[PDB]
Design an enzyme around this catalytic site. Structure first.
Site, PDB file in Angstrom:
ATOM      1  N   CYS A   1       0.808  -1.226   0.000  1.00 33.72           N
ATOM      2  CA  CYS A   1       0.000   0.000   0.000  1.00 33.72           C
ATOM      3  C   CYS A   1       0.846   1.283   0.000  1.00 33.72           C
TER       4      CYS A   1
ATOM      5  N   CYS B   1      -2.013   1.509  -2.839  1.00 34.15           N
ATOM      6  CA  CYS B   1      -2.905   2.624  -2.510  1.00 34.15           C
ATOM      7  C   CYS B   1      -2.295   4.012  -2.548  1.00 34.15           C
TER       8      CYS B   1
ATOM      9  N   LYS C   1      -0.684   5.087  -6.027  1.00 34.04           N
ATOM     10  CA  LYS C   1      -1.813   4.981  -6.957  1.00 34.04           C
ATOM     11  C   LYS C   1      -2.749   6.222  -6.827  1.00 34.04           C
TER      12      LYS C   1
ATOM     13  N   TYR D   1     -10.336  -3.624 -10.517  1.00 34.37           N
ATOM     14  CA  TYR D   1     -10.074  -2.229 -10.177  1.00 34.37           C
ATOM     15  C   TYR D   1      -8.704  -1.648 -10.477  1.00 34.37           C
TER      16      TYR D   1
ATOM     17  N   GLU E   1      -8.129   1.515 -12.821  1.00 35.98           N
ATOM     18  CA  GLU E   1      -7.431   2.679 -12.300  1.00 35.98           C
ATOM     19  C   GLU E   1      -6.251   3.109 -13.137  1.00 35.98           C
TER      20      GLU E   1
ATOM     21  N   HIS F   1     -27.032  20.977   1.259  1.00 33.30           N
ATOM     22  CA  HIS F   1     -27.270  21.490  -0.088  1.00 33.30           C
ATOM     23  C   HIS F   1     -26.383  22.678  -0.434  1.00 33.30           C
TER      24      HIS F   1
HETATM   25  C1  LIG Z   1     -26.067  34.120  -0.780  1.00 35.27           C
HETATM   26  C2  LIG Z   1     -26.817  32.965  -0.062  1.00 35.27           C
HETATM   27  C3  LIG Z   1     -26.248  31.666  -0.031  1.00 35.27           C
HETATM   28  C4  LIG Z   1     -26.917  30.605   0.597  1.00 35.27           C
HETATM   29  N1  LIG Z   1     -26.344  29.318   0.531  1.00 35.27           N
HETATM   30  C5  LIG Z   1     -26.998  28.289   1.087  1.00 35.27           C
HETATM   31  C6  LIG Z   1     -26.482  26.975   0.910  1.00 35.27           C
HETATM   32  O1  LIG Z   1     -25.445  26.766   0.296  1.00 35.27           O
HETATM   33  N2  LIG Z   1     -27.191  25.928   1.411  1.00 35.27           N
HETATM   34  C7  LIG Z   1     -28.415  26.125   2.100  1.00 35.27           C
HETATM   35  O2  LIG Z   1     -29.052  25.145   2.503  1.00 35.27           O
HETATM   36  N3  LIG Z   1     -28.908  27.363   2.268  1.00 35.27           N
HETATM   37  C8  LIG Z   1     -28.239  28.452   1.777  1.00 35.27           C
HETATM   38  N4  LIG Z   1     -28.815  29.727   1.852  1.00 35.27           N
HETATM   39  C9  LIG Z   1     -30.122  29.927   2.563  1.00 35.27           C
HETATM   40  C10 LIG Z   1     -31.255  29.490   1.816  1.00 35.27           C
HETATM   41  O3  LIG Z   1     -31.276  30.209   0.539  1.00 35.27           O
HETATM   42  C11 LIG Z   1     -32.476  29.830   2.640  1.00 35.27           C
HETATM   43  O4  LIG Z   1     -32.318  29.260   4.002  1.00 35.27           O
HETATM   44  C12 LIG Z   1     -33.766  29.313   2.006  1.00 35.27           C
HETATM   45  O5  LIG Z   1     -33.853  29.795   0.606  1.00 35.27           O
HETATM   46  C13 LIG Z   1     -34.925  29.838   2.776  1.00 35.27           C
HETATM   47  O6  LIG Z   1     -36.100  29.230   2.324  1.00 35.27           O
HETATM   48  P1  LIG Z   1     -37.571  29.920   2.627  1.00 35.27           P
HETATM   49  O7  LIG Z   1     -38.594  28.989   2.081  1.00 35.27           O
HETATM   50  O8  LIG Z   1     -37.600  30.307   4.050  1.00 35.27           O
HETATM   51  O9  LIG Z   1     -37.531  31.165   1.824  1.00 35.27           O
HETATM   52  P2  LIG Z   1     -37.035  31.613   0.333  1.00 35.27           P
HETATM   53  O10 LIG Z   1     -36.535  30.465  -0.442  1.00 35.27           O
HETATM   54  O11 LIG Z   1     -36.260  32.742   0.456  1.00 35.27           O
HETATM   55  O12 LIG Z   1     -38.354  32.044  -0.339  1.00 35.27           O
HETATM   56  C14 LIG Z   1     -39.164  33.184   0.140  1.00 35.27           C
HETATM   57  C15 LIG Z   1     -39.872  33.746  -1.046  1.00 35.27           C
HETATM   58  O13 LIG Z   1     -40.938  34.687  -0.610  1.00 35.27           O
HETATM   59  C16 LIG Z   1     -40.998  35.793  -1.512  1.00 35.27           C
HETATM   60  N5  LIG Z   1     -41.601  36.918  -0.813  1.00 35.27           N
HETATM   61  C17 LIG Z   1     -41.100  37.714   0.229  1.00 35.27           C
HETATM   62  N6  LIG Z   1     -41.972  38.539   0.663  1.00 35.27           N
HETATM   63  C18 LIG Z   1     -43.101  38.361  -0.051  1.00 35.27           C
HETATM   64  C19 LIG Z   1     -44.391  38.942   0.002  1.00 35.27           C
HETATM   65  N7  LIG Z   1     -44.726  39.889   0.883  1.00 35.27           N
HETATM   66  N8  LIG Z   1     -45.275  38.494  -0.856  1.00 35.27           N
HETATM   67  C20 LIG Z   1     -44.920  37.503  -1.715  1.00 35.27           C
HETATM   68  N9  LIG Z   1     -43.740  36.882  -1.854  1.00 35.27           N
HETATM   69  C21 LIG Z   1     -42.868  37.337  -1.001  1.00 35.27           C
HETATM   70  C22 LIG Z   1     -39.526  36.052  -1.955  1.00 35.27           C
HETATM   71  O14 LIG Z   1     -39.497  36.699  -3.324  1.00 35.27           O
HETATM   72  C23 LIG Z   1     -38.894  34.549  -1.944  1.00 35.27           C
HETATM   73  O15 LIG Z   1     -38.918  33.927  -3.230  1.00 35.27           O
HETATM   74  C24 LIG Z   1     -28.174  30.831   1.243  1.00 35.27           C
HETATM   75  C25 LIG Z   1     -28.751  32.171   1.236  1.00 35.27           C
HETATM   76  C26 LIG Z   1     -28.094  33.200   0.581  1.00 35.27           C
HETATM   77  C27 LIG Z   1     -28.700  34.511   0.524  1.00 35.27           C
HETATM   78  C1  LIG Z   2      -1.752  -1.131  -7.466  1.00 33.99           C
HETATM   79  C2  LIG Z   2      -2.439  -1.444  -6.196  1.00 33.99           C
HETATM   80  C3  LIG Z   2      -3.415  -0.551  -5.710  1.00 33.99           C
HETATM   81  C4  LIG Z   2      -4.143  -0.853  -4.505  1.00 33.99           C
HETATM   82  N1  LIG Z   2      -5.057   0.098  -4.057  1.00 33.99           N
HETATM   83  C5  LIG Z   2      -5.708  -0.154  -2.895  1.00 33.99           C
HETATM   84  C6  LIG Z   2      -6.551   0.855  -2.359  1.00 33.99           C
HETATM   85  O1  LIG Z   2      -6.775   1.896  -2.952  1.00 33.99           O
HETATM   86  N2  LIG Z   2      -7.130   0.628  -1.115  1.00 33.99           N
HETATM   87  C7  LIG Z   2      -6.904  -0.539  -0.403  1.00 33.99           C
HETATM   88  O2  LIG Z   2      -7.388  -0.657   0.731  1.00 33.99           O
HETATM   89  N3  LIG Z   2      -6.120  -1.516  -0.908  1.00 33.99           N
HETATM   90  C8  LIG Z   2      -5.514  -1.345  -2.150  1.00 33.99           C
HETATM   91  N4  LIG Z   2      -4.610  -2.297  -2.599  1.00 33.99           N
HETATM   92  C9  LIG Z   2      -4.415  -3.516  -1.812  1.00 33.99           C
HETATM   93  C10 LIG Z   2      -3.477  -3.320  -0.625  1.00 33.99           C
HETATM   94  O3  LIG Z   2      -2.193  -2.810  -1.084  1.00 33.99           O
HETATM   95  C11 LIG Z   2      -3.285  -4.631   0.022  1.00 33.99           C
HETATM   96  O4  LIG Z   2      -4.587  -5.224   0.250  1.00 33.99           O
HETATM   97  C12 LIG Z   2      -2.468  -4.584   1.369  1.00 33.99           C
HETATM   98  O5  LIG Z   2      -1.140  -3.998   1.150  1.00 33.99           O
HETATM   99  C13 LIG Z   2      -2.314  -5.973   1.893  1.00 33.99           C
HETATM  100  O6  LIG Z   2      -1.634  -5.960   3.189  1.00 33.99           O
HETATM  101  P1  LIG Z   2      -0.795  -7.224   3.714  1.00 33.99           P
HETATM  102  O7  LIG Z   2      -0.389  -6.929   5.114  1.00 33.99           O
HETATM  103  O8  LIG Z   2      -1.563  -8.437   3.387  1.00 33.99           O
HETATM  104  O9  LIG Z   2       0.528  -7.219   2.748  1.00 33.99           O
HETATM  105  P2  LIG Z   2       1.420  -6.139   2.021  1.00 33.99           P
HETATM  106  O10 LIG Z   2       1.122  -4.799   2.425  1.00 33.99           O
HETATM  107  O11 LIG Z   2       1.424  -6.463   0.608  1.00 33.99           O
HETATM  108  O12 LIG Z   2       2.872  -6.468   2.603  1.00 33.99           O
HETATM  109  C14 LIG Z   2       3.513  -7.755   2.374  1.00 33.99           C
HETATM  110  C15 LIG Z   2       4.951  -7.558   2.500  1.00 33.99           C
HETATM  111  O13 LIG Z   2       5.634  -8.840   2.614  1.00 33.99           O
HETATM  112  C16 LIG Z   2       6.959  -8.736   1.942  1.00 33.99           C
HETATM  113  N5  LIG Z   2       7.339 -10.016   1.595  1.00 33.99           N
HETATM  114  C17 LIG Z   2       6.800 -10.881   0.666  1.00 33.99           C
HETATM  115  N6  LIG Z   2       7.369 -12.064   0.731  1.00 33.99           N
HETATM  116  C18 LIG Z   2       8.317 -12.021   1.715  1.00 33.99           C
HETATM  117  C19 LIG Z   2       9.229 -12.982   2.249  1.00 33.99           C
HETATM  118  N7  LIG Z   2       9.299 -14.277   1.815  1.00 33.99           N
HETATM  119  N8  LIG Z   2      10.015 -12.578   3.229  1.00 33.99           N
HETATM  120  C20 LIG Z   2       9.942 -11.343   3.677  1.00 33.99           C
HETATM  121  N9  LIG Z   2       9.139 -10.353   3.277  1.00 33.99           N
HETATM  122  C21 LIG Z   2       8.324 -10.757   2.262  1.00 33.99           C
HETATM  123  C22 LIG Z   2       6.711  -7.852   0.726  1.00 33.99           C
HETATM  124  O14 LIG Z   2       7.879  -7.131   0.402  1.00 33.99           O
HETATM  125  C23 LIG Z   2       5.559  -6.852   1.246  1.00 33.99           C
HETATM  126  O15 LIG Z   2       6.149  -5.598   1.704  1.00 33.99           O
HETATM  127  C24 LIG Z   2      -3.890  -2.069  -3.775  1.00 33.99           C
HETATM  128  C25 LIG Z   2      -2.894  -2.997  -4.265  1.00 33.99           C
HETATM  129  C26 LIG Z   2      -2.164  -2.697  -5.458  1.00 33.99           C
HETATM  130  C27 LIG Z   2      -1.084  -3.600  -5.889  1.00 33.99           C
END
Ligand SMILES: Cc1cc2nc3c(=O)[nH]c(=O)nc-3n(C[C@H](O)[C@H](O)[C@H](O)COP(=O)(O)OP(=O)(O)OC[C@H]3O[C@@H](n4cnc5c(N)ncnc54)[C@H](O)[C@@H]3O)c2cc1C
Ligand SMILES: Cc1cc2nc3c(=O)[nH]c(=O)nc-3n(C[C@H](O)[C@H](O)[C@H](O)COP(=O)(O)OP(=O)(O)OC[C@H]3O[C@@H](n4cnc5c(N)ncnc54)[C@H](O)[C@@H]3O)c2cc1C
Lengths: 485, 485
Positions: B51, B56, B59, B197, B201, B460
């Site tokens: 690994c 791992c 890779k 895999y 990869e 969201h």
């Molecule tokens: C810049 C920004 C980034 C944000 N990013 C995230 C985020 O990444 N993830 C997340 O979960 N939340 C985020 N939020 C918050 C999220 O947008 C609000 O929590 C959510 O939209 C509120 O839902 P609501 O139903 O309370 O009101 P709103 O979705 O605001 O809807 C209220 C609606 O009522 C209308 N309205 C208002 N007064 C009147 C009225 N008197 N008569 C009729 N219609 C009216 C408005 O025009 C509006 O469309 C973000 C907010 C802002 C401003």
């Molecule tokens: C290309 C590649 C990508 C992989 N990607 C992932 C991944 O993304 N995620 C994941 O969880 N697993 C992945 N694996 C698998 C992971 O590497 C193995 O499952 C893990 O290393 C196994 O652990 P182990 O203790 O069994 O042996 P290893 O970690 O293989 O260690 C065995 C050791 O024994 C030594 N050895 C062998 N024979 C002898 C001997 N006779 N005397 C002394 N020493 C000896 C070797 O040199 C080696 O260092 C990948 C494997 C490969 C080849």
């Protein structure tokens, strides 16, 4: 009554609730929104904020911004190309984004057409009484009443709106709404705010800026991303700085003025000054209830405009419910949708359901991104007598090679140490938004830290780190940090 | 008493885990044996295992490098303008970077052994004299110089596996994954033989680094590549490899290979087809590496393929001789070999018997695009339960319609026991699926049901949210018979 239901706001939650009711339950629903397509003058529109000027477009833009790092990082993996020739084209990004969003906008006409009982009504919704919803020409309660809807139930789902500052020059600033339609990328940009929207945009501007530009991020507080894991806040701050973003904490604009060449001059409260092409305010999102005339129906609202609700989203008036951002619970799209579905089950399927707002996974599409779910240790410490904090970080091998050696991947797990239950999982690094989704299923099932470490890792991945954390880094005893318990 | 408490032949994933655990955590006198320290020719695998050296680790780094071909290409749709003619792969820099990374790991072992009292590394070919004596010889040749004679209480056979060869005329002209890691140049024309895999990869790696005008073919004697994996994902993976330029040749198998005058290989398939390639790599299998251990000297039982027969606790028919890892031909993955090594030590030295759970083990295929899978494929699930439900969902992310890689479909398939909702298998294809599958494995170990998946709130916008949005089966298997209801 004429309608079984009238939804004010046809967004994430409102559109989900309306269509569920009419579609899965043969109710006659009226959904109201301001526009049918994205963009000015209203920005949000049918589909909501997420579809129009939220999650969907911003994610496309962050994806576009990620290529700046991708083109640079490919070099270590033996990719030759003229890197001096690279020029990001903002107009092309905005054009593709527009076409994608318009396509989702177009998708609705068929949605409605095909759903009998589901109608769209355009204009400003407001209440006359607990069974009458007005659709007016404008937000002014004195404006023309275009429609009067008689209905059994009312669902308020108007979302939120960008918060402004009110200093001199506020009108010279933009917010996320206008950021989505800028004619060109700012060479020098100031993102005001420590929240996720601000940070996500600072990343977007950082990538699309003219070579030699600069993006500054100003936060009035001590550290960005208030509410997220303290260590990740600190670590993300360093990685944003590593990529060229000047994170300015204890920083707030005092006043903005327009220079002769059209740029913006900023005088900070500290006395510091600077010029930018763009000054974007991303300081908060306010519940949008201010023009709905809630008192007309006696609906209780918090000082900040949040419509008060119970677990089933019922306001104090029994036939009026509110969901989504307007309720100021968890401001995310999938939560609004979940609440919208729960409401329909409760009201029209005789299946009372309360959306579970705990252990909700969320992502921060910063560069690099975050994926978090559950409590930060500080909050857990207040609710449990013994809390354990597990932390693991490492710089992936691929990053030593790429040259982005500052890209540490970090995983922090918070548990109730009494039983090992995982209370929060906080990750920083690439793929963390995708990993956290499946982590959320485990937390929903009440996984303990042992359920994590007894699972065989998938190798090689960053996620396998979740399965190799067996010993706490430190603890909190009744709210106090101790290195041992 | 014996000189050593334990002698491990093969200091790889499992062997080095078992050795270190015994000496560190149990103060046992342990000798670990491997063929070399530095990765590469002549033995390829080295102290650290397959690994770390030729598996791992390198890779994954090569797959990451290969991915830049697509990502650099996809940047154009997001507005990234650059001299597209200047983009070119540099295989030698990839190899050098990978070599430097792997060597740094090789170098870490020095401290590991120095800091572990009672743990010693012995360099050479290990073989059995009897159940209490292990020889360390000069080469695999039973007649080579005996470097050391090790008297011991227990012996752990952890020698891994080795690439299977064809044994047809010209086999000697082909290479395996071992040599593929050290090729001086990327082949412009290459043939990957095998549908498993590693072959898939390498096909993607070669497909990216080949000189323009190049070609990669993938010949597999069977019907569909990746036997053992979800059938629908196999079909989809094959088309996406085809869409990226790979000619996938199922029912193809080299019959003879000869060396052309210009040094290129000429392959004549069984089909009658013929073609020339710069490299012909066989990745048709990996055989238990037990043939030169002289197992008969201790009476150790092996299968026809050389696999050392073991019980659930990894013990051979000889009570003081255990065997873990690939050499046991169980689940050929690093984390599993590692788990078996730790279980072995707990059983033998901590007197806390533990049998590795080889069920519900998640794994990934780092193809382009990748796969992340866990549990039963529907065909096998149909065979053990009377009512099986299959859920499916696929979508093409909006970002790929913009990047131009429109063939990049993301797929999620869930197999459940319909009678109780238990999730039997989860199969994913597309970017981040190896990352997402890790936590899926934690919940399947926890006995997750389909409702646990769909009651979890989505993050969201992500591809992973698809996992939490599936609630209606696509079809079923009623007593092995597939049905729609
Ligand atoms: C810049 C920004 C980034 C944000 N990013 C995230 C985020 O990444 N993830 C997340 O979960 N939340 C985020 N939020 C918050 C999220 O947008 C609000 O929590 C959510 O939209 C509120 O839902 P609501 O139903 O309370 O009101 P709103 O979705 O605001 O809807 C209220 C609606 O009522 C209308 N309205 C208002 N007064 C009147 C009225 N008197 N008569 C009729 N219609 C009216 C408005 O025009 C509006 O469309 C973000 C907010 C802002 C401003
Ligand atoms: C290309 C590649 C990508 C992989 N990607 C992932 C991944 O993304 N995620 C994941 O969880 N697993 C992945 N694996 C698998 C992971 O590497 C193995 O499952 C893990 O290393 C196994 O652990 P182990 O203790 O069994 O042996 P290893 O970690 O293989 O260690 C065995 C050791 O024994 C030594 N050895 C062998 N024979 C002898 C001997 N006779 N005397 C002394 N020493 C000896 C070797 O040199 C080696 O260092 C990948 C494997 C490969 C080849």
């Amino acid at each position: 009554r004429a309608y079984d239901l009238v939804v004010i706001g046809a967004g994430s939650g409102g559109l989900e609730a309306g269509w569920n009711a009419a579609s899965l339950h043969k109710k006659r629903v009226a959904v109201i929104d301001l526009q049918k397509h994205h963009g000015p003058p209203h920005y949000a529109a049918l589909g909501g904020t997420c579809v129009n000027v939220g999650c969907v477009p911003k994610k496309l833009m962050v994806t576009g911004a990620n290529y700046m790092d991708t083109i640079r990082e490919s070099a270590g993996f033996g990719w030759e190309l003229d890197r001096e020739s690279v020029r990001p084209n903002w107009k092309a990004l905005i054009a593709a984004k527009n076409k994608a969003v318009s396509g989702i906008n177009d998708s609705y006409e068929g949605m409605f057409a095909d759903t009998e009982g589901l109608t769209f009504h355009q204009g400003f919704g407001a209440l006359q009484d607990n069974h009458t919803v007005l659709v007016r020409e404008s937000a002014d309660p004195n404006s023309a009443v275009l429609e009067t809807l008689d209905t059994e139930y009312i669902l308020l789902a108007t979302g939120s709106w960008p918060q402004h500052l009110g200093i001199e020059g506020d009108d010279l600033c933009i917010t996320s709404n206008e950021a989505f339609y800028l004619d060109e990328a700012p060479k020098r940009a100031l993102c005001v705010g420590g929240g996720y929207i601000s940070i996500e945009f600072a990343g977007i501007f950082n990538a699309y800026k003219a070579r030699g530009g600069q993006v500054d991020l100003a936060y009035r507080g001590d550290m960005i991303l208030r509410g997220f894991d303290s260590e990740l806040r600190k670590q993300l701050t360093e990685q944003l700085r590593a990529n060229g973003i000047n994170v300015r904490t204890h920083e707030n604009p005092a006043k903005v003025t327009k220079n002769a060449d059209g740029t913006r001059h900023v005088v900070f409260e500290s006395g510091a000054e600077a010029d930018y092409d763009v000054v974007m305010l991303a300081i908060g999102r306010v519940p949008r209830s201010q023009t709905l005339q809630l008192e007309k129906a006696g609906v209780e609202v918090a000082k900040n405009g949040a419509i008060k609700v119970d677990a089933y989203s019922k306001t104090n008036v029994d036939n009026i419910y509110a969901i989504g951002d307007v309720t100021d619970r968890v401001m995310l799209t999938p939560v609004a949708i979940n609440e919208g579905a729960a409401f329909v089950d409760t009201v029209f399927a005789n299946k009372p359901r309360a959306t579970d707002h705990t252990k909700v996974a969320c992502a921060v599409f910063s560069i690099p991104p975050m994926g978090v779910c559950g409590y930060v240790e500080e909050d857990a410490a207040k609710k449990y007598d013994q809390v354990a904090v597990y932390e693991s970080s490492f710089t992936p091998l691929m990053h030593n090679i790429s040259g982005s050696t500052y890209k540490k991947f970090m995983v922090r797990i918070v548990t109730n140490h009494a039983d090992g239950e995982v209370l929060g999982v906080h990750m920083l690094g690439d793929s963390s938004p995708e990993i956290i989704q499946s982590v959320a299923i485990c937390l929903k099932m009440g996984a303990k830290i042992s359920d994590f470490y007894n699972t065989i890792g998938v190798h090689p991945t960053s996620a396998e780190e979740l399965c190799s954390m067996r010993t706490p880094a430190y603890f909190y005893e009744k709210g106090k940090r101790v290195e041992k318990i």
